[PDB]
Design a protein around this ligand. Sequence first.
Ligand SMILES: [Ca+2]
Ligand SMILES: [Ca+2]
Lengths: 540, 540
Amino acid sequence: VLERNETMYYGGSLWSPPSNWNPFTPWNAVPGTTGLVYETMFFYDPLTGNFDPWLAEKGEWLDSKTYRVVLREGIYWHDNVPLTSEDVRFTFEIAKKYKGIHYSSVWEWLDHIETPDNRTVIFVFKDPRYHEWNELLYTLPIVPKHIWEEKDETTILQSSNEYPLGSGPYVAHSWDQNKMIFERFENWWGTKVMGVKPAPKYVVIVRVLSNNVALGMLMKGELDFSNFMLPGVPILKKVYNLNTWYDEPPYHLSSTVVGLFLNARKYPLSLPEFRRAIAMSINADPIVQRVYEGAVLKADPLGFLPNSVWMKYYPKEVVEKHGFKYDPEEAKSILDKLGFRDVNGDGFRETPDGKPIKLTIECPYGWTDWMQAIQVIVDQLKVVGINAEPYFPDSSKYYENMYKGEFDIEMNANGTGISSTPWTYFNTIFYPDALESEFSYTGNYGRYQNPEVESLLEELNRTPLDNVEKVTELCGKLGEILLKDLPFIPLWYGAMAFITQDNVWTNWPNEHNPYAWPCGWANWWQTGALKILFNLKPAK
Amino acid sequence: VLERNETMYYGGSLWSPPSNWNPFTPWNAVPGTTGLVYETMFFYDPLTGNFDPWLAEKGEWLDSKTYRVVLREGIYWHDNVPLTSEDVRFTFEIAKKYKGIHYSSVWEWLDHIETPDNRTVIFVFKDPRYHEWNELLYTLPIVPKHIWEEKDETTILQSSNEYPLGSGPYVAHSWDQNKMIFERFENWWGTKVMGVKPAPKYVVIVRVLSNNVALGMLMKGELDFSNFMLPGVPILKKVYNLNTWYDEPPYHLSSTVVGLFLNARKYPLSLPEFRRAIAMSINADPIVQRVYEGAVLKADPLGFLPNSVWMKYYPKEVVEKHGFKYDPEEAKSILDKLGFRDVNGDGFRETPDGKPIKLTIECPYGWTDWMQAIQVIVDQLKVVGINAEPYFPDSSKYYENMYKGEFDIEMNANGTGISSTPWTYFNTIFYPDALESEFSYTGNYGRYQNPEVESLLEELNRTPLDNVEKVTELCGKLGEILLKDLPFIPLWYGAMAFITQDNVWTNWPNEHNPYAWPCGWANWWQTGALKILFNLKPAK
Ligand SMILES: [Ca+2]
Ligand SMILES: [Ca+2]
C-alpha cells in the first residue's frame, strides 16, 4: 500500500498496459521510464528555450564542427557503477552498430566521438546540423554501457527491460494492467550533486479507459496531475476547484499547430491561388469559441506556437506583409479570377472547363472536436462556392492516407508539436523527401514541391541557434513561401492540457509561476514534469 | 466484499455517520430504514397523487368519521411473527402513551381504533381531518408490537435500534463512518404476495463530504443514484453521459417552493401594498437563467408545484385575476401612492414621515446559489428605490431567526416541499398559531395575521380530497388572500435533484417513463425510490 500523502498520481499518457521499459524505444516505454529512471544530458524548457545541465555540467561548440560535453562529477548508475563519458559515447555508438535505433541517422553527419577522460565527450562532426543536434541533446536518454554492450539487435530494440537499470531519481517498483509505480531512489546521485530531490516518494502513472474516469478521479482528488483532454474547462474551474495554467481563456498553454494539409498534386488543390482562397474562406473563431469554449488559441497566419522558443525567431515583417486573413469576399474574387465559376446554377464552382468540384476534408472518426471543426470548415467553404464534405475514416486509414498523400484536404497536427527550434515545424510542412517516397512519415504529406525550400531548410539546420538574426531571416524566407503557396494552412493551436488539484500536492506551475512545461508524455519528463516533482510541496 | 453488479450505490441524503435506525424518528434514522426495512400502509406517488396498496390491501372512508384499512393476507416480520391489524393499532396507540412521538397529535382528533380481525383496522375519528390523514397514510412506518410494547419512553424515542426488526424487502447488513449497507431479505413477504422483488441484492447509502466527491463518483461510475445538488448540469449531460429527468431545461422535477417571507409585524413590511411592491419589483428570470443555468422552473404567482397533485386543485381564475408579475414601474407607482418617497435625494425611498428604510434579505452563509439570488433581488429592489442589503448569518442563526420571526425579508423553502395536498403549502404560509408562539416551527414565520385564513385552513383540512370542486374552491379563497396580502412571495421551485448513470443499472425513471418520484431522502423511499428498485434492470 502507498501512503497517499507521499504519492503523486499522474495520468494522461498511458493508454495500454505497462509492458515496455526499453530506453531505445523511449516513446513506447512506459511514461517516466526516460526522465525518472534514465536521464539525459540536459533538461530543456519549451517555454523559454533554456537548456539546463543535468548529466552534462556544460556543453558548447568549441568550433563550428566540434561539440564538447563535460559531465558532472560523481554520477553513478543505480548499481553504483560510475556513469562516465564512455556511457555517453556508447549511447551514440550503439546506434551506428544497430541502425534500427531511432537516432541512427546522426552518424550521417557525426564523424566520431573522443573521450580524453571519464568526464569529457568530444563530438567531431562531418556536417554539423545545429538544429537537429539541439533536439538530440535533451531527447536521448543515456544508457549504461556495462548493461547493454553485449546485447544483440533484437534485445536492444525489442526487450521489455523490466526493472530498468538507470541513473535517475526513481526506480521501477511495480505495475499492473492499469498503473505503473515508480519509487524514489534515495541514493540518487542527483541529490548529492545537484542538491534537488523529488518530493513524492512514489509516482504513479494511471491508465484510464475514458475521460469520464479521469475527470472523476480529479474531482475525487484521486488524480493530482492530469494531461487528459477534458472538455468543459470553464465550468470545472468556476464550480469544482480544478486549476489550469491560465486563470482565464485560453486556460491551457499551446503545444501543437492544428491546420490543413492540401494535396498539392490533385487539381485544383495543385493551384496555389486555389489554396489561398480556401485559407481566406475559413474563420477559426467559431471553432475556438463554439467547439473548444475558448480553451485554445487561434493561430497567426504563420502558425508559430506562442509560449515557445520559436517566437524568438518570429518573422514579423514577413507575416504582416504576406499573411492571410478571413476574407470570403476576396476568396470569391480569387476564384472568379482563377476561372472557377458556377456554370450549372447549383451554387458551387466548377473547374475552368466546367467540371464539378467536391473536396473531402478528413480526420479520424471519434476525434469529436476535430469532427465538429471540419463541419464548420465545410460550411464556410460552401459559402464561397467550394463544395466540400466531411470524411471520417478510422484512425488507421487516416494515418495511412496521411503517409501516402491520399486525401484532398486533411486536418493534421502530426509533427507540429512544440520543440527547441522552428526547424521541426518547417521540416514537417515542407519535408522535401516526401516527393520521392511512397510513405512520408515526417511531413509534407500533400507532396508540395518548391525548388528553394530544400536549400533553406538545410541552411536553417546549419545555422547556430544563437545566430538569432540569421535564423529569423531564414524563418522569414520559409514563412514567405508558406504564406504565398499555402501547402499547409495553420488554424489553431492544440492545448497542452494540464489540470491539477491541491488536496495532496501544491505549488504546481501556472501562469503566475511558469517554472516548468507540464507534460507527462513518454520522453517529455525531462522538459518540465520532473522539475515539477522537485518543487511540489505537501498540502496542509 | 459486494459484487458491483448486484449492488446499487445511492447518495444525496446521508450527511453524518450512520448511527440511528429508530422508526419513531424516521427523518433522523439512516435513509432507507423506513421504506427498505420498515413498511407503510400505502405507497404514495407525488407525481400523480395516486396511493398504492402496500401493507394495506385497501383503505377507505366507510362514512365521514370512519376509515377502514384491510391488510393484505400473509404479511410477516423478518422473524416470521405475522404482521397484523394489532401492529397497526399499536403503531398509533403507542403515540398516545408517549406523546413525544412525532405524530401524537393525531389523538387530538382520532377517537379510538377497532380491530375485528387480524386484517381489519377501523379508525373512528372525533374530528376527521382528511388532509392530515392522507399525509399519515404514507409517512408513518408500521412497527412490530411484539418488539416495542414493553420499551419505555427513552428507548422508544432515543434507542439507536441497530439491526432493525422490520417487515420490508431489506435488512440492515453493515455500516461504517461513510456508508450504510442494506441486504435484500430473500424471504420478504412482498415477493410472495405482491409478486415484486427489488433488483439489487445490496443497497448502499453513500456519505460524501463534498459535491466534488459526489460528482467524481458519478463520473467514475461508482454512484448509480444521486440526489446531490450538483451545479453544471447542462455540460455534464452534453459531454459526460450523465442523465437527468428532463432531456432539456429544467432538467429536474420540482420539489420545493422557494420564496420570501416578510415580517408582517415590522413597518413598513407590515403594509400589504408595500409587500406587493416588493413582489412586483422582482424578476426571477435572471435567477433561473444566470444562477441556476435553467435547472429550475420559475414559480407561478401562487407557487403551486408542477409535477404534483396540487395542480389537480389549481385555482386558475383566481390566479389570473389576482396574480402579480414583474412590473417595476407599477411598483414605483404603488410606493408613490403609499407615501414612500425619496425625500433626501439618495435615490432610496423614505417613510411617509421621512425616515430611512433599509431592509435585510437573508439566507444561510454558504448556500451559494441562494446568496447569488439574494444579491439579484437586492439590486432589483434598489431599482424601484427600496434600499436593501444581503445578510448571511450562519445556518443556526438563520433557523433561529426563522422560528422567532426576527428578520425583515427571508428566503425560505421550509415546509413548502411536495406533498399529497396543497393544505401543507397553505399551512406553511399561513400557520395561524405562529402569532401565539415565541417559536414557530411549522410556518407563518413573519407572523402574518388574517381573520379568515384560519377558518379556511380548517375547512380545507376537513374537505375530502376527492371533492375536487370544493378543495379547488378553498384553494382559490386561500390563494386570493395570499395574492392580495403577499405574506409570502413565491419565486421559483427548488429542484428534485436526480442524476443517474447506466453502467451497472438501467431503466431509471425519467420524463419519457415517469413511473416513480426519485427521492432517496430519509422517509421518502415509499414515495418512489423503492419502486425504482423493483424496476431496475442490470446493464449489458
Ligand atoms: Ca456549379
Ligand atoms: Ca432617500
